[PDB]
Design a protein around this ligand. Structure first.
Ligand SMILES: *N(C(=O)NC1CCCCC1)C1CCCCC1
Lengths: 47, 131, 209, 157, 127, 156, 127, 127, 156
């Protein structure tokens, strides 16, 4: 087991964090594309 | 000859390319898939990808996470949520980032919160390696 | 045929034509960008599917429909809905998810008491892996221990054609533990847990793109 | 037609009735966008009376100009505000109908008489949005705005 | 008058809203009920040729619709329902029909008996 | 026009030809909704014949009422139900078409004569949905129903 | 002549796009700016009865809108704004109005004077 | 009659809703084939003024398009083909033209002979 | 309407003056595709005149057809052929401009009377592409083609 698991976290969520980190570690010249991706539009409709 | 496919949701690096070998960062070490390796499945880890092309001087890449697959046939597919060449990474930033993370951790008690910080630390830390 | 009425009709059709020509150009722009980002996505999504076709997966013994919120796109929604009702009928327990308000309004009423979740804010801004991860997460965090699921969407073919298709979601971490999976050894019972979760986001992303 | 057309010039107030409106069950079938009065002036009736009247005319002409478009492209393309006027416009059109005392044998309803102040108030409130949660039919064939609220209650359950 | 009093205006409003609802717009419970009621009454006013009905009989079939008893019956069944309902009351309820015709009205008593007849007959019909 | 309009009153059956129908290739160009007969009565032609005619005219009129919304947006925007009336209607419009013997000399198609019993049946089957799986073109310019299916086969 | 031509051009541009007012979600910056200028220049052409304006008064209000000092103000308040604004300048700024007359145009000085009255009066008006 | 019959049929099939062109390799198989003949045959029906053609020359060029000998040519080349083809037959195959005329029919003999003339000519034609 | 309909039976050509073109600064404000002439035929004005004319019309048409693909998509996406037809077209539409003598009192610029053969050739060279190395504004408001080449030298 990993630390993130058992802690309630799943792998997609890990990948999420990992992928974002790599982004924040880029340089404006490639930082633009960051927006043209990693969206968050989707909205939950739970009933 | 193995058909190697390496890509991210956004960019594709290799598509059924005949590469002699590839080095990928997994949760359990860094497996080196060869033109003829036994079938397997593995989840990625913040690290480095090394693609020994057909002609020497290999190409490097950085991966945040994702998956890798080796099938019965000599077909392999590496899929990273995000994969970039070192060519586009600022080392200076990573440092600044590993610092902050290790700081938040020192201020977190929440197990889940900590996990999210820990993971971040691991990633940013892994950034130092090829940079 | 009254010069009054005729004029009334011309009035409303000249506007329609104007608003309708506008909507066309906006779309063709959204399309152009979408057609391109789709190149990589396929290779990526087809890659995710490269494991299962390259090696069997069945099931001993969740319908996901994807489209959008905006209409005026011919039969995009009706198609997936049509095939969505078809499955729910032919079938084993039934539970469903619709990404894009239109699905939640169409293959709906008849099957509300057959819903798990629904998604909004789909189609206006280009889809992301990030949105796919929300869909996946929302499911994993659901009490539906689905044994097998299918994902129904419209597979592009050309500006003048598409085909509603289905993709199996053997995400059952349980099913990925069959004979055919004996070929691949050195696999922790829980390394798959990560593997499946991931390939679940990849497949939702693909359909979305 | 020359007969009616030559008659407008001899009047101080015109009440124009329409078949298109009568056909919808709206009585009196007065066309709100074709009835006029020489005294509809803020200096004569007060700017409150003037503005509400003028506000009613604007939301109605706007819906009317909209109608044929949405009948083709649907409502979904309207903004939340553009469609909020569509719903108030229809409510206002309904609040203009009225059960006439003299008309009991036709409406099957008890005739009604509404004071001027009550009229202005009621139309003002709908324009302001103070009733966007009541259903359309609550405004149909009633007197004062209170009956709209009460009908809505009678309609709930 | 007791059954048709407000039906004309109501059917006018029904046809208006029906045309407007075709615009897929969200419908509140109020308009959905109007649509339901309008579509059913539209069926009850259908009539074949060469068989004019006695007033007490029209009153009886109008009643079943205007009082809401048919709001849940499939609209395509309304004509068959009426044909059977009518032969029923004519065959076994001549006294009720005769009282409505004689008093030229629906007494509280006649009203109470119709309710009992339609609810029960309907239930059987939908069996 | 006063000439024609005054003539209606003198007829027992009226066959109104339509220019818009003929331009669709449908012959005879008879408007199915503007043609009448004082004999279309259940007590004269029978209830089956009577009901099949009312049925055809009903679906044709419903399709007609839709055509206005189809003119701009088209069929793809219709409810999965209206798409259905459209489909059967269009198949019925073509099944009303028929090759004439007297036009053989220029059409190149053998003329056809369909018996009344065969006509009722064919139209019943379309209305009942028995051919929702057959393509429209199969119904155009044929005699009896069997020729429609056969043609739907030569469509390989 | 100094402002008329510009207002004429901007309203003409607005007319071509006016049809997107209630159907412009996916609009671009430019066409969205034409909509806002137009709806406002349109409000500035409204006028009540029995109150013809001096030429200096007409140009002062047209100049404001044409230079975009009201592009952010809500359309429905413009009438009330123009009213209040005009009383203020006729009351406290006859000097300004006088020069627009004498100079026979709005100079650099007058322009500076106008911008400061409208941006501060506007802020207070929106309080 | 021997060539215009099939041309009519085919040209009709083409006319069977072809406003859809724009897609090329996107349409089906036999439908891109109808736009194939269709546009070719359409180019054959174009004609300039003051140059009426003998019926025998007419069937010669229509024979070319209706038998397929233009399918592989570039739409913008059919007129160059036709003109070149016609001066070639006028000048070298008068006899053949004579027979089609004189007989008023394309004999199986004349057909086979016509087949050879177009095949060879098409072959040496440098589009 | 009967009036214009009767007049058209006698007209051999038309000159359409428009605001749209005037608002683009092209004077005279003649619409290059709306204006026509019966004598625009090879048998009458000659094959050379006809071919050049037809060329200008087509390029102006092709330019009008690209307005869509350019607007929403981008100019940096048209094919080399298209990109070039946009430059020649714009130059063409400018070369149709012309200063008049009658208006020398208002413009201060000398008017131009361009001889037919000079006109036919000027455009022939633009279509030919013999001036693809010059800026549009070089052909705006001038006489003969030479005057385009000169106006170009100006300063830079
Ligand atoms: N009836 C009417 O005005 N007379 C009565 C009405 C009730 C109260 C006393 C006077 C109308 C006459 C014209 C037709 C409609 C009824």
């Amino acid at each position: 087991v990993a630390y993130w698991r058992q802690a309630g976290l799943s792998y997609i969520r890990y990948s999420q964090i990992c992928a974002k980190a790599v982004r924040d570690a880029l340089k404006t010249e490639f930082k633009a594309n960051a927006m043209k991706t990693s969206g968050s539009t989707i909205k939950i409709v739970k009933v | 000859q193995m058909s190697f496919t390496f890509a991210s949701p956004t960019q594709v690096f290799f598509n059924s390319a005949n590469v002699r070998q590839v080095d990928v960062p997994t949760q359990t070490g860094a497996f080196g898939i060869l033109a003829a390796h036994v079938p397997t499945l593995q989840v990625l880890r913040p690290g480095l990808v090394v693609v020994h092309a057909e002609d020497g001087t290999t190409s490097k890449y950085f991966v945040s996470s994702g998956s890798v697959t080796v099938n019965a046939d000599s077909s392999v597919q590496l899929l990273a949520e995000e994969a970039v060449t070192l060519d586009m990474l600022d080392l200076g930033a990573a440092k600044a980032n590993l610092e902050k993370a290790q700081s938040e951790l020192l201020g977190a008690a929440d197990e889940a919160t900590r996990a999210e910080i820990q993971i971040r630390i691991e990633a940013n830390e892994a950034l130092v390696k090829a940079l | 045929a009254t010069l009054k009425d005729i004029t009334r009709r011309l009035k409303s059709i000249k506007n329609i034509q104007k608003i309708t020509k506008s909507m066309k150009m906006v779309a063709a722009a959204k399309y152009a960008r979408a057609e391109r980002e789709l190149k990589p996505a396929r290779v990526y999504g087809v890659g995710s599917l490269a494991l299962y076709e390259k090696a069997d997966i069945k099931t001993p013994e969740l319908i996901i429909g994807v489209s959008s919120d905006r209409g005026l796109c011919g039969a995009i929604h009706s198609s997936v809905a049509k095939q969505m009702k078809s499955e729910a009928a032919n079938l084993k327990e039934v539970k469903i998810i619709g990404v894009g308000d239109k699905i939640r309004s169409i293959l709906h009423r008849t099957h509300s008491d057959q819903f798990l979740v629904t998604f909004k804010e789909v189609g206006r801004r280009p889809p992301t892996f990030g949105d796919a991860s929300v869909i996946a997460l929302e499911l994993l965090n659901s009490g539906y221990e689905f044994d097998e699921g299918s994902i129904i969407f419209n597979r592009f073919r050309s500006v003048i054609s598409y085909k509603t298709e289905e993709k199996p979601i053997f995400s059952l971490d349980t099913i990925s533990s069959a004979e055919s999976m004996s070929i691949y050894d050195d696999i922790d019972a829980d390394v798959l847990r990560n593997y499946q979760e991931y390939s679940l986001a990849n497949i939702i992303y693909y359909s979305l793109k | 037609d020359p007969a009616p057309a030559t008659t407008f010039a001899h009047l101080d107030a015109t009440t124009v009735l329409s078949r298109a409106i009568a056909e919808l069950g709206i009585y009196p079938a007065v066309d709100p966008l074709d009835s006029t009065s020489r005294i509809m002036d803020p200096n004569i009736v007060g700017s409150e009376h003037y503005d509400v009247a003028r506000g009613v005319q604007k939301i109605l002409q706007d819906y009317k100009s909209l109608q044929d478009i949405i009948a083709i492209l649907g409502m979904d393309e309207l903004s939340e505000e553009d469609k909020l006027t569509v719903s108030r416009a229809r409510k206002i059109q309904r609040f203009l109908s009225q059960p006439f005392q003299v008309a009991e044998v036709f409406t099957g309803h008890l005739g009604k008489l509404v004071p001027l102040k009550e009229t202005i108030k009621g139309f003002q409130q709908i324009l302001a949005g103070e009733y966007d949660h009541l259903p359309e039919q609550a405004f149909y064939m009633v007197g004062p705005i209170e009956e709209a609220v009460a009908k809505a209650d009678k309609l709930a359950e | 008058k007791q059954v048709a009093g407000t039906m004309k205006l109501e059917l006018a409003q029904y046809r208006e809203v029906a045309a407007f609802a075709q615009f897929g717009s969200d419908l509140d419970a109020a308009t959905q009920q109007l649509l339901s009621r309008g579509v059913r009454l539209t069926e009850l006013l259908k009539q074949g040729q060469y068989s004019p009905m006695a007033i007490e009989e029209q009153v009886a079939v109008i009643y079943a619709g205007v009082r809401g008893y048919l709001d849940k019956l499939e609209p395509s069944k309304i004509t068959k329902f009426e044909n059977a309902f009518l032969s029923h009351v004519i065959s076994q309820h001549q006294a009720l029909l005769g009282k409505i015709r004689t008093d030229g009205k629906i007494s509280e008593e006649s009203d109470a008996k119709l309710k009992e007849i339609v609810t029960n007959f309907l239930a059987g019909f939908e069996a």
